[PDB]
Design a protein around this ligand. Structure first.
Ligand SMILES: CCCCC/C=C\C/C=C\CCCCCCCC(=O)O[C@H](COC(=O)CCCCCCCCCCCCCCC)COP(=O)([O-])OCC[N+](C)(C)C
Ligand SMILES: *[C@@H]1O[C@H](CO)[C@@H](O[C@@H]2O[C@H](CO)[C@@H](O)[C@H](O)[C@H]2NC(C)=O)[C@H](O)[C@H]1NC(C)=O
Ligand SMILES: *[C@@H]1O[C@H](CO)[C@@H](O[C@@H]2O[C@H](CO)[C@@H](O)[C@H](O)[C@H]2NC(C)=O)[C@H](O)[C@H]1NC(C)=O
Ligand SMILES: *[C@@H]1O[C@H](CO)[C@@H](O)[C@H](O)[C@H]1NC(C)=O
Lengths: 438, 65, 245, 85
């Protein structure tokens, strides 16, 4: 399937940024309608693998400040951008498209030393892949210090030139549609750790009796940087430390968690006990694992803290029993990528959920119950969201939940404990009012 | 007192982890040679470069079976 | 895929054209290099990635060039990374790096100046050996009797390793004659003219102690033996696979 | 729907606790004393050698009071130890 060619591209400028552990792409597109029928839709081309690895996708006008309706569609795959007001059959449009993928270049030399610099190999299509023909194009690469090509082609036009921290490619002036044949393989220098959270289980517990919100996060972290040739030698690591080589190294020594303002009662444990190397500073929680995380190593751990409920939960204006909570979806290290997120919110026993919404599309949502420390009844209402490809500081939205919690349900918990105790007391009385003498 | 000439090298094991205060040390048994040479002779081969490697003479090996 | 190393001063590449063309016939791609008139060194590896599946070394008098091209360490690294090897070293054309690399494999060829002599031979001009001395049917066993021309050749001593595969040994009445006073290197069945070696990673090497075996002259007597010998050494003839244990 | 809920959340008053956490420890220490007193009295009534029709009445009323107190103090003490309900 191909979308009809209702548009033509005046100019195409693709800039790829490789500074972080994820690939960011901005396209400057100028389009004009070529048919007489007015069309409000534009289609974006993505390869199957890139489509699967897309995390974030948005677009807007080069002039306006608000975003249009840009939705992915579910073997080139397509995203659709919808226009608010239809266009003339022959008129100009200036779009700016932004995307963030969950992929990154693999280390070209897979095994390097403890102090050697790292290089990554990233493979992307070189000419613009689109379903609408383009009469002008350009490509740029930013974010790194050095760029080289792996097996370059003979044709001079299919080659690029260097600027300062930049790599511009050929300014071609006629490209047909679906011309994704030549594949470019670039090698760049990235000397930082590549953090990958394979699974996050984030649990938020809300309590009206204590007026607190408690956050418990379970991370399963890996490092996708170059593996260590010759194995780990604590002597070499100590000789690097005492040499005061604070250079940007590609192994994790300390993580910095950014928490909501006013957090208290921090803790940092793992599957084997409590880790003592953690230190809290305003809004920041610095954490040192038991061992440094070199390329290819795993580390599963748990962090937690507490906050005041009055910052996330507000009361409806129509009644004093309808509450609206706005809960952040991610609170983690600065530069990290997530592959599976399960976000659970626990509302008190007698709460009935009335409305739910997420700022970004989720893969699943569910509601159940779970018993806790004093839940003699059914237990806390557990609302679970499932998300797939999330990036640390581009998924900064907040989930909105509107629920109901009457005063009856508020007071019913001490009542349940009292009924349990009263039943035990009646049982004691019964046991002390009948004789078993012979 | 320990001197760097006291500890001979390991040719059959490889250090994979040493704790921060050196209390626990974990080694891994290396896999055997594809050619069938002893790990001791691979180690000697690595630790030795001599111009006059050896004389022409002949091996004292036994009968091929 | 295949890299052929030929020293022009010892024996020209043209002489061994017969079997090389047959490699093109079986879809092999090839690259040539002469060490007599080369300046830059061959690059076997490109960032932990070898660029040749096979390597063929033709008769050569060892010197600075061979050592520069393929040191013993690089040869062992290539062989350990599933690379196949074919070696040739005749009396008067035996290098030192090849001899050392074979000594690391448990194969000890005779040095320069030692030659095989057999008086009870049907040939007074050259060295000839019948198919009676074939030692492994999984490499080559002739359906009918034959004889192979070897000429001035050498022999090797072998160890008791699982990985060594003796292919063709010297005749029973043969012996090693040295120009000097050296004790005879070999004697009888304990000398071998064609030997093989299989890595534990299933790489393969074959060593032939004669420069005459693959020459275009002996095309009539050694064509098949050589053809399926080249088939064996390149993991093309007798490879096995196990499925669904 | 996201828009409307966002506007609501951003145009409402915050959450006001029923009883502040800082106060709950005192309330727990006081309710524990009251619970101990009442329950220990009803055990005296169980030991009493008086009629059955009146021992039942006194025990039931005293337990219906002590249990309310004990539940309230259980909530307060749990909240004060760091285990929020
Ligand atoms: C029969 C009467 C006996 C009288 C004596 C009673 C207690 C002994 C005195 C002091 C002990 C309190 C110190 C322990 C609390 C801190 C340790 C901790 O905090 O550990 C807790 C384990 O929770 C516990 O089990 C503590 C139980 C709380 C007991 C409070 C005592 C008042 C109620 C007494 C029982 C009344 C009977 C009612 C039956 C209907 C860590 O929980 P977590 O890691 O899952 O974090 C949870 C965080 N999320 C939820 C986000 C994952
Ligand atoms: C720590 O977390 C990692 C990451 O999820 C776990 O690694 C997975 O383990 C399962 C079972 O062994 C494998 O099937 C997966 O392939 C592993 N994934 C990766 C990316 O390695 C690991 O099991 C966890 N360890 C503990 C003790 O919980
Ligand atoms: C969304 O809800 C759950 C995610 O927890 C999944 O469906 C259930 O998955 C559990 C996990 O084993 C099963 O025991 C249940 O039988 C599944 N079905 C139900 C109805 O609970 C799944 O990811 C999603 N379910 C959908 C889309 O129906
Ligand atoms: C290299 O060139 C020829 C090539 O066959 C060879 O015979 C000769 O001995 C070598 N040296 C010189 C100087 O030609």
């Amino acid at each position: 399937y191909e979308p009809p060619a209702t548009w033509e591209n005046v100019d195409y400028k693709r800039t790829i940024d490789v500074s972080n552990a994820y690939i960011s792409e901005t396209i400057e597109i100028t389009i004009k309608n070529i048919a007489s029928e007015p069309a409000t839709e534009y289609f974006t081309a993505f390869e199957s693998g890139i489509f699967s690895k897309v995390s974030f996708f948005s677009a807007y006008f080069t002039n306006e400040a608000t975003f249009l309706n840009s939705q992915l569609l579910a073997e080139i795959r397509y995203g659709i951008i919808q226009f608010p007001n239809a266009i003339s059959p022959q008129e100009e449009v200036s779009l700016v498209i932004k995307s963030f993928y969950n992929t990154v270049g693999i280390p070209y030399p897979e095994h390097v030393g403890m102090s050697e610099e790292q290089h990554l190999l990233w493979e992307t299509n070189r000419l613009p892949l689109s379903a609408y023909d383009t009469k002008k194009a350009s490509f740029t690469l930013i974010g790194s210090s050095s760029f080289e090509e792996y097996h370059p082609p003979n044709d001079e036009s299919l080659l690029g030139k260097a600027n300062g921290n930049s790599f511009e490619f050929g300014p071609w002036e006629d490209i047909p549609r679906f011309s994704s044949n030549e594949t470019l393989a670039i090698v760049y220098s990235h000397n930082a750790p590549l953090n990958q959270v394979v699974n996050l289980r984030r649990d938020i517990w809300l309590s009206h009796w204590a007026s607190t919100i408690q956050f418990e996060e379970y991370y399963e972290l890996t490092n996708k940087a170059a593996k260590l040739s010759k194995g780990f030698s604590r002597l070499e690591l100590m000789k690097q430390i005492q040499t005061q080589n604070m250079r940007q190294t590609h192994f994790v020594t300390v993580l910095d968690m950014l928490l909501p303002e006013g957090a208290t009662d921090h803790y940092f444990t793992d599957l084997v006990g409590l880790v003592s190397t953690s230190h809290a500073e305003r809004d920041h929680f610095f954490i040192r694992p038991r061992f440094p995380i070199f390329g290819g190593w795993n580390y599963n751990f748990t962090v937690g803290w507490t906050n005041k409920l009055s910052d996330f939960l507000h009361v409806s204006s129509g009644s004093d029993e309808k509450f609206v909570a706005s809960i952040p979806i991610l609170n983690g290290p600065p530069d990290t990528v997530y592959d599976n997120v399960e976000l659970s919110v626990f509302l008190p026993e007698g709460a009935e959920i009335f409305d739910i919404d997420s700022p970004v599309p989720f893969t699943n949502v569910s509601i159940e119950t779970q018993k806790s420390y004093f839940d003699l009844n059914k237990g806390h209402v557990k609302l679970t969201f499932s998300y797939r490809n999330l990036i640390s500081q581009v998924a900064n939205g907040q989930v909105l939940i509107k629920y109901d919690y009457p005063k009856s349900s508020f007071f019913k918990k001490p009542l349940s404990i009292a009924c349990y105790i009263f039943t035990a007391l009646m049982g004691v009385f019964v046991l002390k009012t009948l004789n078993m003498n012979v | 007192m320990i001197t760097p000439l006291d500890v001979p090298p390991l040719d059959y094991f490889d250090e994979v982890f040493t704790s921060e205060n050196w209390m626990v040390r974990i080694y891994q048994l290396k896999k055997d040679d594809a050619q069938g040479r002893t790990l001791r002779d691979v180690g000697e081969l690595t630790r030795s470069s001599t111009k006059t490697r050896r004389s022409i003479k002949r091996p004292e090996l036994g009968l091929r079976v | 895929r295949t890299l052929v190393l030929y020293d022009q001063s010892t024996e020209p590449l043209e002489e061994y054209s017969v079997y090389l063309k047959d490699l093109e016939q079986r879809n092999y791609k090839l690259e040539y290099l002469d060490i007599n008139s080369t300046s830059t060194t061959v690059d076997l590896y490109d960032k932990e990635q070898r660029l040749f599946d096979n390597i063929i070394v033709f008769p050569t008098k060892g010197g600075k060039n061979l050592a520069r091209q393929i040191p013993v360490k690089q040869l062992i690294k290539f062989f350990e990374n599933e690379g196949n090897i074919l070696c040739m070293s005749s009396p008067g054309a035996v290098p030192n790096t090849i001899r050392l690399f074979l000594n690391e494999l448990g194969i000890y060829p005779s040095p320069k100046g030692h030659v095989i002599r057999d008086y009870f031979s049907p040939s007074s001009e050259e060295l000839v050996v019948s198919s009676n001395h074939l030692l492994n049917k999984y490499v080559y066993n002739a359906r009918k009797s034959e004889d192979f021309v070897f000429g001035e050749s050498s022999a090797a001593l072998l160890e008791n390793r699982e990985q060594i595969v003796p292919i063709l040994n010297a005749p029973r009445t043969s012996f090693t004659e040295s120009k000097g006073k050296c004790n005879s290197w070999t004697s009888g069945s304990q000398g071998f003219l064609v030997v093989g070696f299989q890595n534990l990673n299933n790489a393969r090497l074959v060593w032939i102690g004669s420069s005459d075996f693959l020459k275009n002259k002996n095309q009539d007597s050694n064509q098949e033996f050589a053809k399926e010998l080249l088939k064996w050494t390149f993991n093309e003839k007798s490879v096995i696979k196990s499925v669904h244990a | 729907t996201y828009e409307q809920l966002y506007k609501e959340f951003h145009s409402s008053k915050s959450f006001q606790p029923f009883i502040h956490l800082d106060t709950q420890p005192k309330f727990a220490i006081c309710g524990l004393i009251v619970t101990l007193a009442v329950l220990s009295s009803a055990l005296f009534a169980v030991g009493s050698k008086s009629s059955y029709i009146k021992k039942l009445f006194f025990y039931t009323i005293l337990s219906v009071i002590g249990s309310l107190f004990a539940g309230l103090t259980t909530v307060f003490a749990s909240n004060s130890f760091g285990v929020y309900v």
